[PDB]
PDB file of all heavy atoms in Angstrom:
ATOM      1  N   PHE A   1      -4.598  33.360 -59.036  1.00  0.00           N
ATOM      2  CA  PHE A   1      -5.911  32.750 -59.068  1.00  0.00           C
ATOM      3  C   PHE A   1      -6.883  33.740 -59.675  1.00  0.00           C
ATOM      4  O   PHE A   1      -6.746  34.952 -59.491  1.00  0.00           O
ATOM      5  CB  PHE A   1      -6.354  32.344 -57.665  1.00  0.00           C
ATOM      6  CG  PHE A   1      -7.550  31.460 -57.644  1.00  0.00           C
ATOM      7  CD1 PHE A   1      -7.546  30.254 -58.311  1.00  0.00           C
ATOM      8  CD2 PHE A   1      -8.680  31.833 -56.950  1.00  0.00           C
ATOM      9  CE1 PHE A   1      -8.649  29.439 -58.289  1.00  0.00           C
ATOM     10  CE2 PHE A   1      -9.786  31.023 -56.924  1.00  0.00           C
ATOM     11  CZ  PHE A   1      -9.772  29.823 -57.595  1.00  0.00           C
ATOM     12  N   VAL A   2      -7.853  33.214 -60.409  1.00  0.00           N
ATOM     13  CA  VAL A   2      -8.829  34.020 -61.121  1.00  0.00           C
ATOM     14  C   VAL A   2     -10.203  33.660 -60.590  1.00  0.00           C
ATOM     15  O   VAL A   2     -10.598  32.488 -60.611  1.00  0.00           O
ATOM     16  CB  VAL A   2      -8.750  33.798 -62.634  1.00  0.00           C
ATOM     17  CG1 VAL A   2      -9.616  34.792 -63.340  1.00  0.00           C
ATOM     18  CG2 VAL A   2      -7.325  33.928 -63.086  1.00  0.00           C
ATOM     19  N   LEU A   3     -10.926  34.665 -60.118  1.00  0.00           N
ATOM     20  CA  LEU A   3     -12.225  34.482 -59.498  1.00  0.00           C
ATOM     21  C   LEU A   3     -13.285  35.132 -60.372  1.00  0.00           C
ATOM     22  O   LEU A   3     -13.201  36.327 -60.671  1.00  0.00           O
ATOM     23  CB  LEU A   3     -12.232  35.083 -58.098  1.00  0.00           C
ATOM     24  CG  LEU A   3     -13.199  34.474 -57.093  1.00  0.00           C
ATOM     25  CD1 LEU A   3     -12.844  33.043 -56.830  1.00  0.00           C
ATOM     26  CD2 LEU A   3     -13.156  35.261 -55.813  1.00  0.00           C
ATOM     27  N   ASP A   4     -14.274  34.345 -60.775  1.00  0.00           N
ATOM     28  CA  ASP A   4     -15.363  34.809 -61.616  1.00  0.00           C
ATOM     29  C   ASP A   4     -16.689  34.547 -60.923  1.00  0.00           C
ATOM     30  O   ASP A   4     -16.845  33.547 -60.217  1.00  0.00           O
ATOM     31  CB  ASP A   4     -15.348  34.112 -62.967  1.00  0.00           C
ATOM     32  CG  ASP A   4     -16.566  34.433 -63.796  1.00  0.00           C
ATOM     33  OD1 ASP A   4     -16.684  35.589 -64.254  1.00  0.00           O
ATOM     34  OD2 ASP A   4     -17.408  33.533 -63.986  1.00  0.00           O
ATOM     35  N   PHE A   5     -17.641  35.449 -61.133  1.00  0.00           N
ATOM     36  CA  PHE A   5     -18.974  35.323 -60.576  1.00  0.00           C
ATOM     37  C   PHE A   5     -20.006  35.507 -61.673  1.00  0.00           C
ATOM     38  O   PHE A   5     -19.692  35.860 -62.813  1.00  0.00           O
ATOM     39  CB  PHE A   5     -19.233  36.353 -59.476  1.00  0.00           C
ATOM     40  CG  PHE A   5     -18.213  36.355 -58.387  1.00  0.00           C
ATOM     41  CD1 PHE A   5     -16.965  36.894 -58.597  1.00  0.00           C
ATOM     42  CD2 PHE A   5     -18.512  35.840 -57.145  1.00  0.00           C
ATOM     43  CE1 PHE A   5     -16.031  36.905 -57.595  1.00  0.00           C
ATOM     44  CE2 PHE A   5     -17.582  35.852 -56.143  1.00  0.00           C
ATOM     45  CZ  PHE A   5     -16.341  36.386 -56.367  1.00  0.00           C
ATOM     46  N   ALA A   6     -21.258  35.264 -61.301  1.00  0.00           N
ATOM     47  CA  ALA A   6     -22.398  35.578 -62.142  1.00  0.00           C
ATOM     48  C   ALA A   6     -23.164  36.795 -61.656  1.00  0.00           C
ATOM     49  O   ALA A   6     -24.068  37.261 -62.355  1.00  0.00           O
ATOM     50  CB  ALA A   6     -23.352  34.386 -62.200  1.00  0.00           C
ATOM     51  N   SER A   7     -22.823  37.312 -60.480  1.00  0.00           N
ATOM     52  CA  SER A   7     -23.542  38.420 -59.876  1.00  0.00           C
ATOM     53  C   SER A   7     -22.629  39.077 -58.858  1.00  0.00           C
ATOM     54  O   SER A   7     -21.879  38.387 -58.164  1.00  0.00           O
ATOM     55  CB  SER A   7     -24.830  37.938 -59.211  1.00  0.00           C
ATOM     56  OG  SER A   7     -25.337  38.913 -58.319  1.00  0.00           O
ATOM     57  N   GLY A   8     -22.698  40.399 -58.772  1.00  0.00           N
ATOM     58  CA  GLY A   8     -21.784  41.136 -57.926  1.00  0.00           C
ATOM     59  C   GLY A   8     -22.393  41.639 -56.636  1.00  0.00           C
ATOM     60  O   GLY A   8     -21.793  42.467 -55.944  1.00  0.00           O
ATOM     61  N   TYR A   9     -23.582  41.142 -56.295  1.00  0.00           N
ATOM     62  CA  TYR A   9     -24.244  41.609 -55.085  1.00  0.00           C
ATOM     63  C   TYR A   9     -23.355  41.452 -53.865  1.00  0.00           C
ATOM     64  O   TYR A   9     -23.347  42.321 -52.988  1.00  0.00           O
ATOM     65  CB  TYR A   9     -25.548  40.852 -54.877  1.00  0.00           C
ATOM     66  CG  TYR A   9     -26.122  41.015 -53.499  1.00  0.00           C
ATOM     67  CD1 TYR A   9     -26.761  42.181 -53.131  1.00  0.00           C
ATOM     68  CD2 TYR A   9     -26.022  40.005 -52.565  1.00  0.00           C
ATOM     69  CE1 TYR A   9     -27.286  42.336 -51.876  1.00  0.00           C
ATOM     70  CE2 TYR A   9     -26.544  40.150 -51.306  1.00  0.00           C
ATOM     71  CZ  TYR A   9     -27.176  41.318 -50.966  1.00  0.00           C
ATOM     72  OH  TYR A   9     -27.699  41.467 -49.707  1.00  0.00           O
ATOM     73  N   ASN A  10     -22.598  40.367 -53.793  1.00  0.00           N
ATOM     74  CA  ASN A  10     -21.757  40.098 -52.641  1.00  0.00           C
ATOM     75  C   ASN A  10     -20.413  40.795 -52.716  1.00  0.00           C
ATOM     76  O   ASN A  10     -19.681  40.807 -51.722  1.00  0.00           O
ATOM     77  CB  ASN A  10     -21.531  38.601 -52.500  1.00  0.00           C
ATOM     78  CG  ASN A  10     -22.664  37.911 -51.791  1.00  0.00           C
ATOM     79  OD1 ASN A  10     -23.043  38.291 -50.685  1.00  0.00           O
ATOM     80  ND2 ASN A  10     -23.220  36.894 -52.426  1.00  0.00           N
ATOM     81  N   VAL A  11     -20.075  41.370 -53.861  1.00  0.00           N
ATOM     82  CA  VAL A  11     -18.784  42.010 -54.046  1.00  0.00           C
ATOM     83  C   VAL A  11     -18.957  43.515 -53.983  1.00  0.00           C
ATOM     84  O   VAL A  11     -18.340  44.193 -53.155  1.00  0.00           O
ATOM     85  CB  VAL A  11     -18.157  41.599 -55.382  1.00  0.00           C
ATOM     86  CG1 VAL A  11     -16.963  42.442 -55.654  1.00  0.00           C
ATOM     87  CG2 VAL A  11     -17.782  40.160 -55.344  1.00  0.00           C
ATOM     88  N   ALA A  12     -19.792  44.040 -54.876  1.00  0.00           N
ATOM     89  CA  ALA A  12     -19.981  45.480 -54.958  1.00  0.00           C
ATOM     90  C   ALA A  12     -20.291  46.072 -53.598  1.00  0.00           C
ATOM     91  O   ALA A  12     -19.819  47.163 -53.261  1.00  0.00           O
ATOM     92  CB  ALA A  12     -21.103  45.793 -55.937  1.00  0.00           C
ATOM     93  N   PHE A  13     -21.083  45.366 -52.802  1.00  0.00           N
ATOM     94  CA  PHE A  13     -21.479  45.838 -51.489  1.00  0.00           C
ATOM     95  C   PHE A  13     -20.507  45.411 -50.402  1.00  0.00           C
ATOM     96  O   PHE A  13     -20.859  45.435 -49.219  1.00  0.00           O
ATOM     97  CB  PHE A  13     -22.890  45.358 -51.179  1.00  0.00           C
ATOM     98  CG  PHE A  13     -23.910  45.869 -52.137  1.00  0.00           C
ATOM     99  CD1 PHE A  13     -24.738  45.002 -52.810  1.00  0.00           C
ATOM    100  CD2 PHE A  13     -24.028  47.218 -52.380  1.00  0.00           C
ATOM    101  CE1 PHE A  13     -25.668  45.471 -53.694  1.00  0.00           C
ATOM    102  CE2 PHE A  13     -24.957  47.690 -53.264  1.00  0.00           C
ATOM    103  CZ  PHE A  13     -25.777  46.817 -53.922  1.00  0.00           C
ATOM    104  N   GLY A  14     -19.301  45.011 -50.780  1.00  0.00           N
ATOM    105  CA  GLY A  14     -18.217  44.855 -49.840  1.00  0.00           C
ATOM    106  C   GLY A  14     -18.275  43.625 -48.970  1.00  0.00           C
ATOM    107  O   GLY A  14     -17.440  43.487 -48.068  1.00  0.00           O
ATOM    108  N   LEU A  15     -19.219  42.722 -49.205  1.00  0.00           N
ATOM    109  CA  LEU A  15     -19.333  41.539 -48.370  1.00  0.00           C
ATOM    110  C   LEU A  15     -18.227  40.537 -48.609  1.00  0.00           C
ATOM    111  O   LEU A  15     -18.148  39.544 -47.880  1.00  0.00           O
ATOM    112  CB  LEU A  15     -20.680  40.875 -48.602  1.00  0.00           C
ATOM    113  CG  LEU A  15     -21.859  41.786 -48.308  1.00  0.00           C
ATOM    114  CD1 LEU A  15     -23.143  41.099 -48.649  1.00  0.00           C
ATOM    115  CD2 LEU A  15     -21.852  42.180 -46.866  1.00  0.00           C
ATOM    116  N   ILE A  16     -17.385  40.762 -49.606  1.00  0.00           N
ATOM    117  CA  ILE A  16     -16.234  39.913 -49.863  1.00  0.00           C
ATOM    118  C   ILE A  16     -15.067  40.796 -50.261  1.00  0.00           C
ATOM    119  O   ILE A  16     -15.236  41.782 -50.987  1.00  0.00           O
ATOM    120  CB  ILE A  16     -16.524  38.874 -50.952  1.00  0.00           C
ATOM    121  CG1 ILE A  16     -17.441  37.801 -50.396  1.00  0.00           C
ATOM    122  CG2 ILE A  16     -15.245  38.257 -51.415  1.00  0.00           C
ATOM    123  CD1 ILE A  16     -18.068  36.969 -51.437  1.00  0.00           C
ATOM    124  N   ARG A  17     -13.881  40.436 -49.793  1.00  0.00           N
ATOM    125  CA  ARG A  17     -12.676  41.235 -49.993  1.00  0.00           C
ATOM    126  C   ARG A  17     -11.512  40.287 -50.163  1.00  0.00           C
ATOM    127  O   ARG A  17     -10.764  40.007 -49.213  1.00  0.00           O
ATOM    128  CB  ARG A  17     -12.460  42.191 -48.825  1.00  0.00           C
ATOM    129  CG  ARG A  17     -13.612  43.129 -48.612  1.00  0.00           C
ATOM    130  CD  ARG A  17     -13.216  44.261 -47.718  1.00  0.00           C
ATOM    131  NE  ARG A  17     -14.361  44.828 -47.023  1.00  0.00           N
ATOM    132  CZ  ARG A  17     -14.294  45.896 -46.240  1.00  0.00           C
ATOM    133  NH1 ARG A  17     -13.136  46.513 -46.053  1.00  0.00           N
ATOM    134  NH2 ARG A  17     -15.385  46.346 -45.647  1.00  0.00           N
ATOM    135  N   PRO A  18     -11.318  39.753 -51.358  1.00  0.00           N
ATOM    136  CA  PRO A  18     -10.284  38.763 -51.573  1.00  0.00           C
ATOM    137  C   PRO A  18      -8.903  39.392 -51.521  1.00  0.00           C
ATOM    138  O   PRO A  18      -8.765  40.620 -51.462  1.00  0.00           O
ATOM    139  CB  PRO A  18     -10.593  38.218 -52.971  1.00  0.00           C
ATOM    140  CG  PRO A  18     -11.971  38.670 -53.269  1.00  0.00           C
ATOM    141  CD  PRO A  18     -12.124  39.956 -52.570  1.00  0.00           C
ATOM    142  N   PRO A  19      -7.869  38.576 -51.546  1.00  0.00           N
ATOM    143  CA  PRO A  19      -6.505  39.108 -51.486  1.00  0.00           C
ATOM    144  C   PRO A  19      -6.158  39.962 -52.688  1.00  0.00           C
ATOM    145  O   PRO A  19      -6.948  40.093 -53.626  1.00  0.00           O
ATOM    146  CB  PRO A  19      -5.641  37.843 -51.440  1.00  0.00           C
ATOM    147  CG  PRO A  19      -6.563  36.755 -51.024  1.00  0.00           C
ATOM    148  CD  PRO A  19      -7.889  37.110 -51.570  1.00  0.00           C
ATOM    149  N   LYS A  20      -4.965  40.547 -52.660  1.00  0.00           N
ATOM    150  CA  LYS A  20      -4.466  41.323 -53.782  1.00  0.00           C
ATOM    151  C   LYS A  20      -3.796  40.464 -54.839  1.00  0.00           C
ATOM    152  O   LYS A  20      -3.537  40.954 -55.943  1.00  0.00           O
ATOM    153  CB  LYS A  20      -3.476  42.367 -53.286  1.00  0.00           C
ATOM    154  CG  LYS A  20      -4.129  43.552 -52.629  1.00  0.00           C
ATOM    155  CD  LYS A  20      -3.110  44.622 -52.299  1.00  0.00           C
ATOM    156  CE  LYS A  20      -3.777  45.927 -51.904  1.00  0.00           C
ATOM    157  NZ  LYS A  20      -4.333  46.648 -53.080  1.00  0.00           N
ATOM    158  N   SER A  21      -3.512  39.201 -54.530  1.00  0.00           N
ATOM    159  CA  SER A  21      -2.872  38.286 -55.465  1.00  0.00           C
ATOM    160  C   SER A  21      -3.879  37.533 -56.311  1.00  0.00           C
ATOM    161  O   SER A  21      -3.600  36.414 -56.758  1.00  0.00           O
ATOM    162  CB  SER A  21      -1.987  37.303 -54.704  1.00  0.00           C
ATOM    163  OG  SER A  21      -2.763  36.498 -53.838  1.00  0.00           O
ATOM    164  N   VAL A  22      -5.050  38.117 -56.534  1.00  0.00           N
ATOM    165  CA  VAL A  22      -6.135  37.442 -57.223  1.00  0.00           C
ATOM    166  C   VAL A  22      -6.657  38.325 -58.342  1.00  0.00           C
ATOM    167  O   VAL A  22      -6.669  39.555 -58.242  1.00  0.00           O
ATOM    168  CB  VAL A  22      -7.273  37.084 -56.257  1.00  0.00           C
ATOM    169  CG1 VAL A  22      -8.430  36.503 -57.022  1.00  0.00           C
ATOM    170  CG2 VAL A  22      -6.777  36.123 -55.216  1.00  0.00           C
ATOM    171  N   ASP A  23      -7.101  37.679 -59.411  1.00  0.00           N
ATOM    172  CA  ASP A  23      -7.745  38.348 -60.527  1.00  0.00           C
ATOM    173  C   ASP A  23      -9.251  38.227 -60.352  1.00  0.00           C
ATOM    174  O   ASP A  23      -9.801  37.123 -60.399  1.00  0.00           O
ATOM    175  CB  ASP A  23      -7.302  37.737 -61.852  1.00  0.00           C
ATOM    176  CG  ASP A  23      -5.847  38.019 -62.161  1.00  0.00           C
ATOM    177  OD1 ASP A  23      -5.340  39.072 -61.722  1.00  0.00           O
ATOM    178  OD2 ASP A  23      -5.209  37.189 -62.842  1.00  0.00           O
ATOM    179  N   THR A  24      -9.907  39.360 -60.144  1.00  0.00           N
ATOM    180  CA  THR A  24     -11.337  39.417 -59.896  1.00  0.00           C
ATOM    181  C   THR A  24     -12.053  39.919 -61.139  1.00  0.00           C
ATOM    182  O   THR A  24     -11.633  40.910 -61.742  1.00  0.00           O
ATOM    183  CB  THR A  24     -11.635  40.332 -58.719  1.00  0.00           C
ATOM    184  OG1 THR A  24     -10.841  39.937 -57.597  1.00  0.00           O
ATOM    185  CG2 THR A  24     -13.075  40.243 -58.359  1.00  0.00           C
ATOM    186  N   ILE A  25     -13.134  39.240 -61.515  1.00  0.00           N
ATOM    187  CA  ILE A  25     -13.860  39.539 -62.739  1.00  0.00           C
ATOM    188  C   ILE A  25     -15.326  39.175 -62.562  1.00  0.00           C
ATOM    189  O   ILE A  25     -15.722  38.541 -61.584  1.00  0.00           O
ATOM    190  CB  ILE A  25     -13.284  38.778 -63.944  1.00  0.00           C
ATOM    191  CG1 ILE A  25     -13.299  37.286 -63.654  1.00  0.00           C
ATOM    192  CG2 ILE A  25     -11.889  39.230 -64.215  1.00  0.00           C
ATOM    193  CD1 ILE A  25     -12.806  36.470 -64.786  1.00  0.00           C
ATOM    194  N   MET A  26     -16.129  39.569 -63.542  1.00  0.00           N
ATOM    195  CA  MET A  26     -17.539  39.239 -63.592  1.00  0.00           C
ATOM    196  C   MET A  26     -17.891  38.739 -64.982  1.00  0.00           C
ATOM    197  O   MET A  26     -17.331  39.187 -65.984  1.00  0.00           O
ATOM    198  CB  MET A  26     -18.401  40.451 -63.255  1.00  0.00           C
ATOM    199  CG  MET A  26     -19.884  40.241 -63.466  1.00  0.00           C
ATOM    200  SD  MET A  26     -20.822  41.763 -63.298  1.00  0.00           S
ATOM    201  CE  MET A  26     -20.993  41.818 -61.525  1.00  0.00           C
ATOM    202  N   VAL A  27     -18.835  37.806 -65.028  1.00  0.00           N
ATOM    203  CA  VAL A  27     -19.393  37.308 -66.276  1.00  0.00           C
ATOM    204  C   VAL A  27     -20.879  37.094 -66.043  1.00  0.00           C
ATOM    205  O   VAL A  27     -21.268  36.178 -65.309  1.00  0.00           O
ATOM    206  CB  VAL A  27     -18.726  36.013 -66.737  1.00  0.00           C
ATOM    207  CG1 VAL A  27     -19.560  35.357 -67.789  1.00  0.00           C
ATOM    208  CG2 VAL A  27     -17.361  36.314 -67.269  1.00  0.00           C
ATOM    209  N   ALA A  28     -21.707  37.920 -66.673  1.00  0.00           N
ATOM    210  CA  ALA A  28     -23.128  37.978 -66.358  1.00  0.00           C
ATOM    211  C   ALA A  28     -23.975  37.570 -67.549  1.00  0.00           C
ATOM    212  O   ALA A  28     -24.247  38.398 -68.432  1.00  0.00           O
ATOM    213  CB  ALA A  28     -23.503  39.387 -65.906  1.00  0.00           C
ATOM    214  N   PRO A  29     -24.421  36.324 -67.625  1.00  0.00           N
ATOM    215  CA  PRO A  29     -25.404  35.961 -68.643  1.00  0.00           C
ATOM    216  C   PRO A  29     -26.736  36.636 -68.375  1.00  0.00           C
ATOM    217  O   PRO A  29     -27.101  36.905 -67.229  1.00  0.00           O
ATOM    218  CB  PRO A  29     -25.517  34.441 -68.505  1.00  0.00           C
ATOM    219  CG  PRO A  29     -24.319  34.025 -67.746  1.00  0.00           C
ATOM    220  CD  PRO A  29     -23.963  35.159 -66.862  1.00  0.00           C
ATOM    221  N   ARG A  30     -27.462  36.915 -69.451  1.00  0.00           N
ATOM    222  CA  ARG A  30     -28.802  37.488 -69.375  1.00  0.00           C
ATOM    223  C   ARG A  30     -29.760  36.497 -70.018  1.00  0.00           C
ATOM    224  O   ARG A  30     -30.121  36.623 -71.189  1.00  0.00           O
ATOM    225  CB  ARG A  30     -28.844  38.810 -70.050  1.00  0.00           C
ATOM    226  CG  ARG A  30     -27.854  39.810 -69.504  1.00  0.00           C
ATOM    227  CD  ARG A  30     -28.258  40.296 -68.141  1.00  0.00           C
ATOM    228  NE  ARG A  30     -27.863  39.354 -67.108  1.00  0.00           N
ATOM    229  CZ  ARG A  30     -28.192  39.472 -65.828  1.00  0.00           C
ATOM    230  NH1 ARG A  30     -28.916  40.505 -65.425  1.00  0.00           N
ATOM    231  NH2 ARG A  30     -27.791  38.560 -64.956  1.00  0.00           N
ATOM    232  N   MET A  31     -30.192  35.519 -69.229  1.00  0.00           N
ATOM    233  CA  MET A  31     -31.096  34.481 -69.697  1.00  0.00           C
ATOM    234  C   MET A  31     -31.686  33.782 -68.485  1.00  0.00           C
ATOM    235  O   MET A  31     -31.183  33.902 -67.366  1.00  0.00           O
ATOM    236  CB  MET A  31     -30.384  33.462 -70.590  1.00  0.00           C
ATOM    237  CG  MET A  31     -30.164  33.887 -72.024  1.00  0.00           C
ATOM    238  SD  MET A  31     -31.642  34.489 -72.852  1.00  0.00           S
ATOM    239  CE  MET A  31     -30.886  35.339 -74.226  1.00  0.00           C
ATOM    240  N   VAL A  32     -32.763  33.039 -68.728  1.00  0.00           N
ATOM    241  CA  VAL A  32     -33.321  32.190 -67.682  1.00  0.00           C
ATOM    242  C   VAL A  32     -32.325  31.106 -67.299  1.00  0.00           C
ATOM    243  O   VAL A  32     -32.263  30.679 -66.140  1.00  0.00           O
ATOM    244  CB  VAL A  32     -34.662  31.589 -68.143  1.00  0.00           C
ATOM    245  CG1 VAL A  32     -34.486  30.754 -69.410  1.00  0.00           C
ATOM    246  CG2 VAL A  32     -35.323  30.787 -67.023  1.00  0.00           C
ATOM    247  N   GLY A  33     -31.530  30.650 -68.262  1.00  0.00           N
ATOM    248  CA  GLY A  33     -30.580  29.582 -68.023  1.00  0.00           C
ATOM    249  C   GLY A  33     -30.829  28.378 -68.904  1.00  0.00           C
ATOM    250  O   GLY A  33     -29.890  27.745 -69.394  1.00  0.00           O
ATOM    251  N   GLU A  34     -32.103  28.057 -69.116  1.00  0.00           N
ATOM    252  CA  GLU A  34     -32.473  26.885 -69.900  1.00  0.00           C
ATOM    253  C   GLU A  34     -32.376  27.162 -71.395  1.00  0.00           C
ATOM    254  O   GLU A  34     -31.627  26.494 -72.116  1.00  0.00           O
ATOM    255  CB  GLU A  34     -33.889  26.445 -69.529  1.00  0.00           C
ATOM    256  CG  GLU A  34     -34.359  25.198 -70.246  1.00  0.00           C
ATOM    257  CD  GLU A  34     -35.023  25.496 -71.575  1.00  0.00           C
ATOM    258  OE1 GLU A  34     -35.266  26.685 -71.871  1.00  0.00           O
ATOM    259  OE2 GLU A  34     -35.301  24.539 -72.327  1.00  0.00           O
ATOM    260  N   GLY A  35     -33.126  28.150 -71.876  1.00  0.00           N
ATOM    261  CA  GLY A  35     -33.168  28.467 -73.290  1.00  0.00           C
ATOM    262  C   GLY A  35     -31.803  28.685 -73.910  1.00  0.00           C
ATOM    263  O   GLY A  35     -31.660  28.669 -75.138  1.00  0.00           O
ATOM    264  N   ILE A  36     -30.794  28.902 -73.067  1.00  0.00           N
ATOM    265  CA  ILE A  36     -29.431  29.037 -73.565  1.00  0.00           C
ATOM    266  C   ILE A  36     -29.044  27.822 -74.387  1.00  0.00           C
ATOM    267  O   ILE A  36     -28.308  27.938 -75.372  1.00  0.00           O
ATOM    268  CB  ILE A  36     -28.456  29.247 -72.397  1.00  0.00           C
ATOM    269  CG1 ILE A  36     -28.792  30.534 -71.659  1.00  0.00           C
ATOM    270  CG2 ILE A  36     -27.037  29.296 -72.906  1.00  0.00           C
ATOM    271  CD1 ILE A  36     -28.091  30.658 -70.350  1.00  0.00           C
ATOM    272  N   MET A  37     -29.520  26.641 -73.998  1.00  0.00           N
ATOM    273  CA  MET A  37     -29.209  25.441 -74.761  1.00  0.00           C
ATOM    274  C   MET A  37     -29.794  25.526 -76.163  1.00  0.00           C
ATOM    275  O   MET A  37     -29.104  25.264 -77.156  1.00  0.00           O
ATOM    276  CB  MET A  37     -29.747  24.214 -74.034  1.00  0.00           C
ATOM    277  CG  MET A  37     -29.290  22.897 -74.631  1.00  0.00           C
ATOM    278  SD  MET A  37     -27.498  22.752 -74.754  1.00  0.00           S
ATOM    279  CE  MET A  37     -27.033  22.894 -73.034  1.00  0.00           C
ATOM    280  N   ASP A  38     -31.075  25.884 -76.259  1.00  0.00           N
ATOM    281  CA  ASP A  38     -31.703  26.016 -77.566  1.00  0.00           C
ATOM    282  C   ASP A  38     -30.990  27.056 -78.412  1.00  0.00           C
ATOM    283  O   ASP A  38     -30.835  26.874 -79.625  1.00  0.00           O
ATOM    284  CB  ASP A  38     -33.176  26.387 -77.400  1.00  0.00           C
ATOM    285  CG  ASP A  38     -33.856  25.594 -76.305  1.00  0.00           C
ATOM    286  OD1 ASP A  38     -33.619  24.371 -76.221  1.00  0.00           O
ATOM    287  OD2 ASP A  38     -34.620  26.195 -75.522  1.00  0.00           O
ATOM    288  N   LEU A  39     -30.545  28.146 -77.792  1.00  0.00           N
ATOM    289  CA  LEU A  39     -29.791  29.163 -78.509  1.00  0.00           C
ATOM    290  C   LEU A  39     -28.380  28.710 -78.839  1.00  0.00           C
ATOM    291  O   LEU A  39     -27.735  29.310 -79.705  1.00  0.00           O
ATOM    292  CB  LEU A  39     -29.732  30.442 -77.680  1.00  0.00           C
ATOM    293  CG  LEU A  39     -31.014  31.270 -77.704  1.00  0.00           C
ATOM    294  CD1 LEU A  39     -31.097  32.163 -76.485  1.00  0.00           C
ATOM    295  CD2 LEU A  39     -31.088  32.089 -78.975  1.00  0.00           C
ATOM    296  N   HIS A  40     -27.892  27.670 -78.170  1.00  0.00           N
ATOM    297  CA  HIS A  40     -26.537  27.191 -78.400  1.00  0.00           C
ATOM    298  C   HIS A  40     -26.494  26.227 -79.573  1.00  0.00           C
ATOM    299  O   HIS A  40     -25.642  26.347 -80.459  1.00  0.00           O
ATOM    300  CB  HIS A  40     -26.008  26.507 -77.145  1.00  0.00           C
ATOM    301  CG  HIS A  40     -24.753  25.728 -77.372  1.00  0.00           C
ATOM    302  ND1 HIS A  40     -23.660  26.255 -78.024  1.00  0.00           N
ATOM    303  CD2 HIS A  40     -24.418  24.460 -77.041  1.00  0.00           C
ATOM    304  CE1 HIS A  40     -22.703  25.347 -78.079  1.00  0.00           C
ATOM    305  NE2 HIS A  40     -23.138  24.248 -77.491  1.00  0.00           N
ATOM    306  N   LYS A  41     -27.408  25.259 -79.581  1.00  0.00           N
ATOM    307  CA  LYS A  41     -27.438  24.281 -80.662  1.00  0.00           C
ATOM    308  C   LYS A  41     -27.576  24.967 -82.012  1.00  0.00           C
ATOM    309  O   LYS A  41     -27.032  24.496 -83.017  1.00  0.00           O
ATOM    310  CB  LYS A  41     -28.581  23.302 -80.432  1.00  0.00           C
ATOM    311  CG  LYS A  41     -28.529  22.670 -79.063  1.00  0.00           C
ATOM    312  CD  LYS A  41     -29.259  21.348 -79.020  1.00  0.00           C
ATOM    313  CE  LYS A  41     -28.890  20.561 -77.774  1.00  0.00           C
ATOM    314  NZ  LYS A  41     -28.460  19.173 -78.099  1.00  0.00           N
ATOM    315  N   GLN A  42     -28.301  26.082 -82.053  1.00  0.00           N
ATOM    316  CA  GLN A  42     -28.375  26.885 -83.262  1.00  0.00           C
ATOM    317  C   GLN A  42     -27.074  27.610 -83.567  1.00  0.00           C
ATOM    318  O   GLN A  42     -26.992  28.294 -84.592  1.00  0.00           O
ATOM    319  CB  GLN A  42     -29.508  27.898 -83.135  1.00  0.00           C
ATOM    320  CG  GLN A  42     -30.882  27.286 -83.263  1.00  0.00           C
ATOM    321  CD  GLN A  42     -31.965  28.329 -83.426  1.00  0.00           C
ATOM    322  OE1 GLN A  42     -31.882  29.196 -84.293  1.00  0.00           O
ATOM    323  NE2 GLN A  42     -32.989  28.250 -82.588  1.00  0.00           N
ATOM    324  N   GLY A  43     -26.062  27.485 -82.709  1.00  0.00           N
ATOM    325  CA  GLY A  43     -24.806  28.169 -82.901  1.00  0.00           C
ATOM    326  C   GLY A  43     -24.828  29.639 -82.562  1.00  0.00           C
ATOM    327  O   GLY A  43     -23.780  30.293 -82.646  1.00  0.00           O
ATOM    328  N   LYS A  44     -25.978  30.183 -82.182  1.00  0.00           N
ATOM    329  CA  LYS A  44     -26.065  31.595 -81.853  1.00  0.00           C
ATOM    330  C   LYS A  44     -25.516  31.855 -80.459  1.00  0.00           C
ATOM    331  O   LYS A  44     -25.739  31.078 -79.528  1.00  0.00           O
ATOM    332  CB  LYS A  44     -27.511  32.068 -81.930  1.00  0.00           C
ATOM    333  CG  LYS A  44     -28.133  31.909 -83.295  1.00  0.00           C
ATOM    334  CD  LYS A  44     -29.440  32.667 -83.384  1.00  0.00           C
ATOM    335  CE  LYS A  44     -30.389  32.017 -84.371  1.00  0.00           C
ATOM    336  NZ  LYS A  44     -31.242  33.015 -85.072  1.00  0.00           N
TER     337      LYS A  44
END
């Protein structure tokens, strides 16, 4: 199983400790969230 987050506040500080049979990763966008659409339609 592969677990992805948008923020590591709950991981880095040890509040979560998943099994060893898991793939743990992070994916952190840097945007408000909305304008991403406008930046997407432009293909950027």
Side-chain angles (χ1 to χ4, degrees):
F1 192 58
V2 189
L3 207 63
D4 172 70
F5 306 75
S7 164
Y9 166 76
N10 277 306
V11 170
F13 299 125
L15 301 176
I16 287 164
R17 302 195 205 185
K20 283 186 168 285
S21 63
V22 175
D23 292 331
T24 308
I25 57 178
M26 172 189 277
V27 165
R30 303 288 82 186
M31 280 309 163
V32 59
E34 182 272 351
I36 298 167
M37 189 55 61
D38 317 317
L39 283 157
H40 167 49
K41 307 203 165 232
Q42 286 192 52
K44 300 193 209 213

